Symmetry: C4
Subunit: 180 residues, 4 copies
Amino acid sequence: RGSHMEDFVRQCFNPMIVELAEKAMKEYGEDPKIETNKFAATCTHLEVCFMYSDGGSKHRFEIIEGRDRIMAWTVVNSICNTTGVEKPKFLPDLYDYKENRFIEIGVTRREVHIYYLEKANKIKSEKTHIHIFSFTGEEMATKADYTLDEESRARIKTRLFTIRQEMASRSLWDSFRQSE
Amino acid sequence: RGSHMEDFVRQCFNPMIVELAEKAMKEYGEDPKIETNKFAATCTHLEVCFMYSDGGSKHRFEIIEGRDRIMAWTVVNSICNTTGVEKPKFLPDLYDYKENRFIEIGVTRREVHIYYLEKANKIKSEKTHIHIFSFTGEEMATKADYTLDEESRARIKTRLFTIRQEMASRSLWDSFRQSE
Amino acid sequence: RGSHMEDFVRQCFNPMIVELAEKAMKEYGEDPKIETNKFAATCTHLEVCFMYSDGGSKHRFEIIEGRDRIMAWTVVNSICNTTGVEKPKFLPDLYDYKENRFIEIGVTRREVHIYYLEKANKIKSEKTHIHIFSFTGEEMATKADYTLDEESRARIKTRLFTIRQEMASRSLWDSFRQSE
Amino acid sequence: RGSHMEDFVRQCFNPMIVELAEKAMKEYGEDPKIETNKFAATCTHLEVCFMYSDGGSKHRFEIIEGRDRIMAWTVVNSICNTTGVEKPKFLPDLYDYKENRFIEIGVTRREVHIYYLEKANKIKSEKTHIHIFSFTGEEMATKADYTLDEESRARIKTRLFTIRQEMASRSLWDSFRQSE
Ligand SMILES: O=C1NCCc2cccc(c2)OCCCCOc2cccc(c2)C2=NC(=O)C(O)C1=N2
Ligand SMILES: O=C1NCCc2cccc(c2)OCCCCOc2cccc(c2)C2=NC(=O)C(O)C1=N2
Ligand SMILES: O=C1NCCc2cccc(c2)OCCCCOc2cccc(c2)C2=NC(=O)C(O)C1=N2
Ligand SMILES: O=C1NCCc2cccc(c2)OCCCCOc2cccc(c2)C2=NC(=O)C(O)C1=N2
Ligand SMILES: [Mn+2]
Ligand SMILES: [Mn+2]
Ligand SMILES: [Mn+2]
Ligand SMILES: [Mn+2]
Ligand SMILES: [Mn+2]
Ligand SMILES: [Mn+2]
Ligand SMILES: [Mn+2]
Ligand SMILES: [Mn+2]
């Protein structure tokens, strides 16, 4: 295919993130060489989920994103069967052992307002906490409970805007923006 | 022997846990290739003991389980001879430098209620703290003092239920359950 | 060139610091083999900046010094575009996610009093926090807010005086002092 | 020489401790192959000093023991010239950046009472904090200020008694005891 977006994704993100995103897309019938915008988004979503899990105390989070579908659901079942929390219909991204709730992390190129609306209406488990990040430095969380402290969330916002700058410097941002 | 339980234990637990469990069983005249249920249980008990020791503050715990019998008793003697705590008749699993007591960690396929009864009656040192975990997500500790915080114990419960699911998915749980 | 200062810098600082200082000087048209005093100063400034970033809590600081000019400004733009802080005219050394301000770290062979005066007058962004260290063990910070706790700053002062002793023992301090 | 004490020291302590003790003894005209009791004591003293430095918060301690005489005094001079603390006449073992004092750590086979007396009378700098450990599990510190918390000191006491047991099991304790 020879996409410019593909070579930028491989130099922007670390090899473990790229490998997990490639495996995730292929598992769902998506090709990272063609759907290069989806390739960038899944890497971005993966890195955001991992910085998020690094922001709290040790042992605080259980990472669901980044596993295969079967093993991700297996850990969800164990979390539900040991904490009594209701089983979510869709795969979440983390579990907060402190607040005892699942977290769905979103990363959007639109307003954080409209994307949360889509995710809140998509998921039926109203117990699942939602936390949205934008590429412009905005965020929005369920009940205005942002889970982490200010500095951990600020790192994610800074990293997101750096990716945007790197994309625009290569004339790839406009195609990435009008693709969500 | 060629046991399905053997190959699952080697892929479920990390190689250091398997090696320590193999050495522990052989030291007591048990063969991991035949007593494959005991092989799974000792690996599970070993991993639970190590996650437990990782749950507290640094330097808080002294790990007794996972050593050879002679060296495990040597550290117990040093702990007793330096803290004044009475020497337990049976080998415990950890020592809590914070609460100044030995901890016996149990992992059961039955009710956490009955297993503690067996361990409390087995040990005569009533000073030794007892902490039981089940594969269903229940726990029970001496004086209702669970030592660690909620999230460290929840990780162990989640991990235990994941092992149960992995066993049942391979049709090995029923033999493991009716073997304790 | 065969400078004694060059061989001391390579044995005093760790190879990653030397490599970053060499790249920084060459990027600005300076040669570490000739401008050996500048070579020592940039290594010292780099090490001080990194010990500083290690002094606070995790995630607290964003390191700007030690990057290439383009990437350093790219992260600054993301920090400004996500926190609303005004863009500084000159490249700072760190960003404090806790106090929400940029930090300019200085290391001087003169009085900490006069060097801050030069840096305060050089920078127009009065929001940028200034923190000066001397080779004699003195420090001076904006609004007397020294950011870190006492022990993290004391380590830097101790390290600075050790470098001075190592220089004087090799008869290189006097040339280094009367060069700033 | 072929000493039993020599081979036990090499299997009891980690190779970095043995190497530092060997270098320390040779620097003072002592041979680890002959003065095997001194070899064991210097390894024990070195390990105790390092567990001690690991007991406090990060950045809290500056390790003086384990360096060459010239570099150990160079760091002492920098600590004194930056904190204003008086220069000790004899090399201490650590510096407490929290309490702003040097620490002399002793390890004795006699009563902690008599050994402190020798060290307090040896050193003239009454500012230098003294902390003694015994192989029986006793300790004694200046002004009853034990610096670290209870659990960090208990680890050192446990480790000391384990070394004693390992020595006595090899019939080397009695020669080690009546050698101090
Ligand atoms: O967890 C998730 N799993 C999805 C795995 C996946 C990978 C590749 C293709 C695909 C599914 O099909 C897309 C189905 C229609 C959904 O449209 C999108 C588009 C882009 C991102 C997301 C969803 C998304 N955002 C998140 O925040 C997530 O957590 C999350 N997906
Ligand atoms: O510490 C322990 N050391 C035992 C070492 C050992 C290994 C292999 C065989 C064996 C002994 O013989 C069994 C003797 C009869 C005891 O029956 C069992 C069966 C299964 C687990 C345990 C005990 C057990 N549960 C714990 O919780 C422990 O801590 C613990 N053992
Ligand atoms: O961030 C910085 N970037 C400068 C990068 C650089 C490297 C090599 C040569 C050069 C610039 O040209 C010098 C231009 C005139 C400035 O004179 C000096 C001399 C010595 C140190 C500094 C400035 C300095 N002190 C700091 O504290 C800094 O943070 C800092 N520089
Ligand atoms: O720091 C120290 N540096 C000494 C370096 C050294 C190594 C080998 C031989 C030697 C000196 O000559 C001995 C001179 C007479 C002193 O007798 C002893 C005997 C055994 C231990 C100590 C002192 C001692 N105890 C501590 O606690 C220390 O801190 C400490 N030494
Ligand atoms: Mn997801
Ligand atoms: Mn998500
Ligand atoms: Mn046990
Ligand atoms: Mn047990
Ligand atoms: Mn700078
Ligand atoms: Mn600077
Ligand atoms: Mn000493
Ligand atoms: Mn000493």
